[PDB]
Amino acid sequence: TIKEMPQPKTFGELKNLPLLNTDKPVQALMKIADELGEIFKFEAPGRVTRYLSSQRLIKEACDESRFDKNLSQALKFVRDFAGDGLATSWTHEKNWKKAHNILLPSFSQQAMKGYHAMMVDIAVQLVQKWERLNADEHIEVPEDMTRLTLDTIGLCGFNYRFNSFYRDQPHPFITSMVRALDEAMNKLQRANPDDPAYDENKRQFQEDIKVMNDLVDKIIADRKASGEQSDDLLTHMLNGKDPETGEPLDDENIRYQIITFLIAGHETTSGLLSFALYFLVKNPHVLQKAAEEAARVLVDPVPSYKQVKQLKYVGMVLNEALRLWPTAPAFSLYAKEDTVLGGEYPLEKGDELMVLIPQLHRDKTIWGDDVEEFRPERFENPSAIPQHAFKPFGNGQRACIGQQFALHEATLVLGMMLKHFDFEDHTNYELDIKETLTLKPEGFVVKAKSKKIPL
Numbered sequence: 001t002i003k004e005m006p007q008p009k010t011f012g013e014l015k016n017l018p019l020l021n022t023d024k025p026v027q028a029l030m031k032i033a034d035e036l037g038e039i040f041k042f043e044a045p046g047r048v049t050r051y052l053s054s055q056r057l058i059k060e061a062c063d064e065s066r067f068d069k070n071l072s073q074a075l076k077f078v079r080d081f082a083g084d085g086l087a088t089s090w091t092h093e094k095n096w097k098k099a100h101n102i103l104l105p106s107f108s109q110q111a112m113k114g115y116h117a118m119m120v121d122i123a124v125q126l127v128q129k130w131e132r133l134n135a136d137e138h139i140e141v142p143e144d145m146t147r148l149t150l151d152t153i154g155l156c157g158f159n160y161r162f163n164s165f166y167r168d169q170p171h172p173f174i175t176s177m178v179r180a181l182d183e184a185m186n187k188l189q190r191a192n193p194d195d196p197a198y199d200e201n202k203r204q205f206q207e208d209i210k211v212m213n214d215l216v217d218k219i220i221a222d223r224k225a226s227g228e229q230s231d232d233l234l235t236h237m238l239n240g241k242d243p244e245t246g247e248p249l250d251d252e253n254i255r256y257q258i259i260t261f262l263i264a265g266h267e268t269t270s271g272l273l274s275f276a277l278y279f280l281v282k283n284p285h286v287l288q289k290a291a292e293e294a295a296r297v298l299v300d301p302v303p304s305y306k307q308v309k310q311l312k313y314v315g316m317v318l319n320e321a322l323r324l325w326p327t328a329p330a331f332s333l334y335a336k337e338d339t340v341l342g343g344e345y346p347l348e349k350g351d352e353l354m355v356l357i358p359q360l361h362r363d364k365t366i367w368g369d370d371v372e373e374f375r376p377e378r379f380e381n382p383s384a385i386p387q388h389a390f391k392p393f394g395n396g397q398r399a400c401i402g403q404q405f406a407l408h409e410a411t412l413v414l415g416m417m418l419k420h421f422d423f424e425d426h427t428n429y430e431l432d433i434k435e436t437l438t439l440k441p442e443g444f445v446v447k448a449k450s451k452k453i454p455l
């Protein structure tokens with residue numbers, strides 16, 4: 001049988017588009033899903049997408065023999081600076097498979113051991129900065145976490161120090177990257193792309209891409225010319241070879257991968273830490289229990305790799321923050337062939353499906369009826385979690401390569417925060433979620449009272 005798919009309010013020949021005019025599209029899409037259910041059609045001038053919200057359908061959509069990763073309009077605009085990096089490539093570009101296999105060993109749990117000390121390095125700068133604030137002052141949470149994640153990726157990725165914690169105005173590369181990312185997002189909602197009013201926007205965009213390219217190209221060229229072997233991803237990318245060509249990644253592609261790591265990882269990870277902390281201060285019983293685990297486990301001046309792994313509850317809190325607000329909230333797929341989804345919905349080859357992760361994570365048939373509650377205990381038994389139920393890192397071979405990295409980073413950082421300070425929600429902050437490529441709690445601020453424990 002064939003079921004007719006719901007469709008939200010239409011606005012004539014504008015179709016459903018005026019519904020995504022808002023500055024919070026994902027949140028708008030979730031409300032429609034709350035009204036229309038597990039699947040709905042979204043129609044735009046020339047374009048048709050289907051939105052998936054239930055585990056039942058998403059499960060099926062994640063069958064990689066039938067569906068593959070699609071480059072959404074957002075990723076196509078990002079590709080202007082991330083090029084054929086991992087996140088902005090079609091699965092069937094040869095550079096996708098080649099980079100994937102070369103870089104995979106660099107991102108395993110095991111590799112995390114090598115990154116550990118560099119992660120602690122930026123974490124201590126975080127801790128020492130908070131220790132030096134006057135009682136007077138407060139913390140801009142997502143701003144400080146972004147400072148930390150950029151610098152950790154900068155250092156772990158290509159042994160470069162942006163020194164974000166020691167400067168008012170950000171390092172030129174970061175200003176350009178931030179600006180170049182924002183323009184690429186602003187272009188999604190842009191009315192007349194060729195209008196002369198955007199001539200300066202267009203000009204700034206190319207300047208910022210050049211700033212980014214100059215630095216990363218210079219960094220690679222200098223490492224190559226110096227002829228010195230090192231820890232990081234750069235060395236691994238310069239020496240690592242494709243089994244069937246015998247060739248490593250070219251210098252342009254390596255630049256792409258490094259830009260990619262910065263863009264992909266910086267605000268997803270800091271959003272996670274900002275939402276973890278948001279939930280902790282709103283949920284004092286959970287804070288208490290996680291703070292108790294930090295004091296119990298983190299018995300050394302500075303945490304060890306092994307100690308971060310024993311922070312189970314902090315790991316559970318991060319997963320529950322990722323259930324409620326996955327920081328990269330959506331991912332896009334296409335039908336490889338003509339097919340039928342859920343036995344009711346026929347699909348044409350090439351049809352787009354968009355997985356809506358924050359609705360997937362609210363599937364009551366999976367999680368029960370307390371889906372809006374912050375309850376890390378949901379994750380005590382990982383085997384209790386059904387396949388394709390929890391997907392904040394994407395799917396299959398196109399899943400997040402930096403999942404181990406992001407989670408080690410966040411577990412370590414959050415542990416250290418909970419060990420060293422007590423936190424006050426001094427403004428009684430109302431959750432306001434800003435949407436760009438990622439999600440964050442905009443305007444989230446706290447005060448941290450030090451526990452006077454030395455590092």
Ligand code: HEM
Nearest residue numbers: 086087261264265268269328331393394398400401402406
């Ligand atoms: C908690 C933090 C993170 C979240 C929630 C997250 C989420 C995701 C998601 C949902 C995808 C798939 C997107 C799609 O299908 O279009 C993805 C892909 C990717 N992410 Fe992450 N990510 C995080 C951290 C990081 C970090 C730290 C890095 C730095 C290495 C990174 C690098 C990448 C890359 C390279 C891809 C493309 C993988 C491929 O297609 O081969 N991510 N991520």
Ligand SMILES: [Zn+2]
Nearest residue numbers: 338347348349
């Ligand atoms: Zn057809």
